[PDB]
User: Fold this.
Amino acid sequence: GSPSEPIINFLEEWGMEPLEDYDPAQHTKSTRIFVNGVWTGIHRDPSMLVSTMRDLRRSGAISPEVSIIRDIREREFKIFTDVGRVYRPLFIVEDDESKDNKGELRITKEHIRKIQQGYDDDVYGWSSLVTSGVIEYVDGEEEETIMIAMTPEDLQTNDTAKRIKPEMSTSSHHT
Amino acid sequence: DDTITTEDCWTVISAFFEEKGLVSQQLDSFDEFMETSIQDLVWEEPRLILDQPAQHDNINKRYEIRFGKIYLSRPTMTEADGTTHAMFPQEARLRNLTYSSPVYLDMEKSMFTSIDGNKVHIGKVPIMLRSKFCSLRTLDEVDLYKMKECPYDMGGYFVIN
Amino acid sequence: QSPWLLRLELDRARMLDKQLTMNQVADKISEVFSDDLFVMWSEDNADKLIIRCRVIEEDQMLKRIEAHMLDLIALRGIPGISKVYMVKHKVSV
Amino acid sequence: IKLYGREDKGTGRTIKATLPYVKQDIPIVIVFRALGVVPDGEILQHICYDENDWQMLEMLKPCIEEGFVIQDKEVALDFIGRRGSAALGIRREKRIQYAKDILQKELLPHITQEEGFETRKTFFLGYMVNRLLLCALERKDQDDRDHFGKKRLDLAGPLLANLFRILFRKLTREIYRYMQRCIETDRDFNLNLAVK
Amino acid sequence: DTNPRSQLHSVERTFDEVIDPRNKNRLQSLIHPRKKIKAVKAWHFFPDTSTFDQVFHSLKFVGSASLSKDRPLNEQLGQVNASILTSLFKPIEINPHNKWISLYAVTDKLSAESFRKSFNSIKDDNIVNRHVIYDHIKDFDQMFRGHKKLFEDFAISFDDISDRAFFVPIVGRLELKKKRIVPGLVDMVNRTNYAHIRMDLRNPSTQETAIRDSRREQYDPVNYSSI
Amino acid sequence: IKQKLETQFTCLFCNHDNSVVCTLDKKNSIGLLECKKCNLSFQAPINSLSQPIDIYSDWIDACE
Amino acid sequence: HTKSVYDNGETLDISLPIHPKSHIPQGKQDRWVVKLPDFLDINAEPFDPRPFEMNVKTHEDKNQELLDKLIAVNTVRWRYAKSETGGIFKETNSQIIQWEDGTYSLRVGSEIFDMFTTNTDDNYLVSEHNEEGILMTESTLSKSVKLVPASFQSTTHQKLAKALSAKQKKESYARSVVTKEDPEERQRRLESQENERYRLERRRKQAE
Amino acid sequence: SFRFCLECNNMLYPKEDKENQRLLYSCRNCDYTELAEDPKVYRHELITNIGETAGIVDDIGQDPTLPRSDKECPECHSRDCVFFQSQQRRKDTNMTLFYVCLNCKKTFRDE
Amino acid sequence: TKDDFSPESKGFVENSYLRGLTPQEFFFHAMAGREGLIDTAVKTAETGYIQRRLVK
Ligand SMILES: [Zn+2]
Ligand SMILES: [Zn+2]
Ligand SMILES: [Zn+2]
Assistant:
């Protein structure tokens, strides 16, 4: 459980407009913004907002167990700080197109060496990995909007005893 | 950089289990409860009010009491002879006691009148073992052995009777 | 009569699939409704198969008549038999 | 928010809304007017978000026809107040005040609790009716009850919090009863005796 | 940087680094941190001295009360119209339960244009007696929301010749919705408002001017303090 | 069609309880309250959504 | 044909006093309403360095002090600047920057905040005349403007993120204490005293 | 589509003049009456195809869970596209695909 | 990915027990086994009631 007041402050800081200033005829393309199931406002550039919220959560500014969900099909953007949500951790793949590291894990051998040592080269544990943006938590509701590789070998594109992996040929490319 | 092997993934998982353990959810929930939830529940309805428009010279008297801070202590055991001493879970297991701690609440009384207070013991709350309010949280490996507690025991439970 | 008009567009493909004639539907409507409703029907060769109707505040009355017509006009078949399948049976004779 | 009427049965497909401390269901237009938005066009503005969708407008038409009898905010609140399960014989102004209370509080409490903040409640009501229509018009599947992201787990914390809330309310009632009994004797109680 | 001297030094550093809007080279030197786009034009940000004495409220119409939606009303008042820009609002409250707003406007285009031109050109001490008659149009139901902080909202007006931007405080927000008058209360309705209101333009009295200057003395004491 | 229902309302003239009967006719849009002891009759118009509580509240408003 | 309700023709001869304006809008009576963010404050008062230095407040809570420092350094201010010719001029620390795309940005010092403009219809600004109980319109509010930080690397955004992250980290309401005796001792001793005085009162009442 | 009253914002019900023989939209809450342009009072679709392609958004190309094809765009002839099936979820719904280009963002079929 | 009707996406296990299942196949196989256990433990009571009524 986490308080929702900083979330509302961040949303209002980044261009969210309240309900009293909302006209459904004018806003035929805006995204409804929900916080803990409460419709609090609207926004017209949801991509920048979700990128900013996710970057803030990955940096430790927002608590790691806060849910950030973007429903593109329904034009909704939901945030949950409720208590009782079951989550699990996952590695983060660098999805920025403008970056050179696109399609590769953010965690490197430097992180593994720091974890083995136990301290940073100017305590380094699991929380240090979580607040460095190489690992993050996702719950069941946020899992519906992400694309997960099963193994790190899956990130890069005739024996009778070895098991056979899915081809996944329906898509020309996978991000 | 260099690629990430399966052994690196197991190193990361070892870091996870070194930080969290296997019963972290129970202890974290109980610590949240004891730290904030009791105070918030007390402050939900912080004011009892009694009024009496006495006419027996009309004097409208309001009597009201406020609830203040919550004070907690480490669990204690009170014997029949009247003495008290710190309790540990092994003694509670052996003597069929309850591992619980007293809760104190500040009550402030005011006497409002218009013509026209210290710590009170409110009960004992059972303590979850190896939590922030348990006696075994601090004890190191040697005193844990001296207290007849198993170092492999993880906590996350209560001792009632 | 009334100025209100009621025309309904029927799917040509499913009407031909069921092997039905527009005159048959017209006679069914005429029988169930006597002379209370005047009925006209476009011929077979029409680009869109249509059949109009005219009554002889009545907009809601026409709406109820249209709903009743859509609901319980039975063209042909045994009531209760929703679907029929053809099956082959191997019999020893 | 129930949607009465079966397909091709029951004449109109009216939408009635169940309200707390109200004995019988209420059409959506009447409660919408009671919140303080009378014109039917603005009710449709709140509910629907794309005017070209004639099917949802057609499905809302029976509700508009049923609610046309009420045309003012105050009569709508009074109609709320008659069925509010309160003591029989309450006066009209007190009925309207009771409706205002049961409308401000206990109607979507998670949104807000203060006065003059019912715009968000009207927008949320429009959202709920929109979701109901979207599911009713076969545009979306019904919600998965067994979806695990819609579930929550209560650990030791919340369970002990609920239990402690009940027990503390009992203790407070005992303190109240003892105080009422003691004020008869008119003594400067130590207050360490009321608490059990 | 918790030192008060450090905070003061930061304040003077921010004050000294203001770019002159006429300095085109320094304006082009400034670059957007993210967009990487050069600057074109600049304006100074200043408060307004002559308007702090008055009280400003942001007035908005909610729902069907939109003037554009009401086509016959818009056609009657003109398809920016000076009648809209010179309209009058008269809040009258019979009781706490019943409340509404009275709207008045100038039907004639010439009279409204003359009044607007006279009002927007007040820079001297000579005002012509423009006896303008305002006609009632419609009434709306009102609600008011107050701002906890003084400068919660502020409207910005520009001035290209001086390269400045003047902002004014907003005290509260007023929302209006269309009100259907009950047929059983038209008798009392006819006794509340008026069919016409005449506005006379006169020079402000010396005492009222002194009171307004005393009110403005909180903001600007160099040019308005009494001696 | 007139509908006669026994109600648990209280008459304000005789003070006897459980002696109030509501008679509403939806065809003519009228509603009649009769006291089984006082024999008084109260008439008020009714709508399509009318219920006996509506006529009872109308009688209460008329009485005061 | 909705007939006009009011036809009495009664008229009030009310005259309003109006003051000259320091500035007049040109070409359009348009103004932009701007919501005030939490990290930005307006100080209409002239900047006085000595009272500003003498009124700096220090709190134990680091988050509150950091928020006060950020809002103080980011506050829009103005002061009198003595010209080299002997005259006095108004000087401000805030500017408006327009980029090539046509967007506008509010600049205070080195900080730049972007503006997002949303068109609003039937929104006007009025002036309240409480002494006469009427509202006089001023101009039209065509656009609503929201202020957004330019980038992550801006110091204001980093300070806000730090303050909001560390604000919710501090949470400790219950205070520990040490029990030296039985907590039920007070209850039983006061029950004994109450029973004793009950017996004494009963004896006195039987003796009265 | 149905129109609303221009003076009190209620629904404009159709009405017929006996003497004039004209279709007029009239508000029952006032005396306002406006002349109808078309005689199409009501239309009911027993079998409908609306909502099949109406469920389209302009940001659907940013969804990472959608499959990506190399079908040719009819407008700008791009080499990347994102496809999906029908948004309508009845039992009779077809399994045809709707392709969305990553430049013009229009919805087109393969037939 | 969304709208995938391939055999591996909807629960076809192409490996043998000797070869070893992949995690997706493992989860789908566990779903099927759970179905089997629920079906047995639910139909037992209905069968017992039918048998009792037949005997009586
Ligand atoms: Zn009687
Ligand atoms: Zn109308
Ligand atoms: Zn294209």
Residues H 5, 7-8, 10, 27, 29-30, 32 surround zinc ion (ligand 2) (CB under 6 Å). Helices of chain G lie at 49-54, 62-74, 155-167, 185-207.
